[PDB]
């Protein structure tokens, strides 16, 4: 009942090593489905998910034209920002842009997004009203004025409320067997002694999709937030994700600990304990 589409653009300058590289990738939820790399032998939009392969030549050529044009424009933009910040021509810089639409379980734009960053710092973003901008500094204010004069926000709003949602719904239907299939995590608790009177309890969640998940350790029904080592959710490489949470407990008190797992693919939240 929750879905989104996002495109991620990365433009990187590299003085002395050619023109800036432009890469674009597209995602529906946690599934990448397209890519484009200006450094490719033959720069063209390529499929990265099985359900997008059915799109015809016009779709691919339309995508490629968009990315090829963006490639050239982001080279001008990098030159422009270098100037806005009085930076030398010797450094490498990066502009990133991410945009897309969010849908609720009952279709129609829930919210639209468009944000850009320069060297990893927020630069300019479209406000939630999809009509106004928030510029980070006086440099971004130049971009803002340029974009207002070119009706950039109006065009973006039209896309976010229109084509973005339409195509996202199309992809969701075409790839429903995977995009609309939540795979529950396979779970288990491991025990690793760390000393004579302390042991590590690690709660595992494997093979799940989407990536959103909640893993928590409780002691006597109380959250051990400050004592839990929780690793970043990581991709398995087969579309699914993995994650763990660990806590060091006093040997002999392991039963006072419970691991709680919440995920869309589970019939009901899980409560696990170490099973000797």
């Amino acid at each position: 009942g929750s879905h989104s589409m996002r495109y991620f653009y990365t433009a990187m300058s590299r003085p002395g090593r050619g023109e800036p590289r432009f890469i674009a990738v597209g995602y529906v939820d946690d599934t990448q489905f397209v890519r484009f790399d200006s450094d490719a032998a033959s720069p063209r939009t390529e499929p990265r998910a099985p359900w997008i392969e059915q799109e015809g030549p016009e779709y691919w050529d339309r995508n490629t034209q968009i990315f090829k044009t963006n490639t050239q424009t982001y080279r001008e933009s990098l030159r422009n920002l270098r100037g806005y910040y009085n930076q030398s021509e010797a450094g490498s810089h990066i502009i990133q842009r991410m945009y897309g639409c969010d849908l609720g379980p009952d279709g129609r734009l829930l919210r639209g997004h468009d944000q850009s960053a320069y060297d990893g710092k927020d630069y300019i973003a479209l406000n939630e009203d999809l009509s106004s901008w928030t510029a980070a500094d006086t440099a971004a204010q130049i971009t803002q004025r340029k974009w207002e004069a070119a009706r950039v926000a109006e065009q973006l709003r039209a896309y976010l409320e229109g084509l973005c949602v339409e195509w996202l719904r199309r992809y969701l239907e075409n790839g429903k067997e995977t995009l609309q299939r939540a795979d529950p995590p396979k779970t288990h608790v491991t025990h690793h002694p760390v000393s004579d009177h302390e042991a590590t309890l690690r709660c595992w969640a494997l093979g799940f999709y989407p990536a959103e998940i909640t893993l928590t350790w409780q002691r006597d029904g109380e959250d051990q937030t400050q004592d839990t080592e929780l690793v970043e959710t990581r991709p398995a490489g087969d579309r699914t994700f993995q994650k763990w949470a660990a806590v060091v407990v006093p040997s002999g008190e392991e039963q006072r600990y419970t691991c709680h797992v919440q995920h869309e693919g589970l019939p009901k939240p899980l409560t696990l304990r170490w099973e000797p």
């Binding site: 597209g26 995508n63 968009i66 044009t69 424009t73 933009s77 422009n80 502009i95 630069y123 065009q155």
Partner: peptide
């Protein structure tokens, strides 16, 4: 589908 190009010149930053 990514954001379509405008009728005119794509606006740089």
């Amino acid at each position: 589908l990514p954001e379509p190009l405008p009728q005119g010149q794509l606006t740089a930053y």
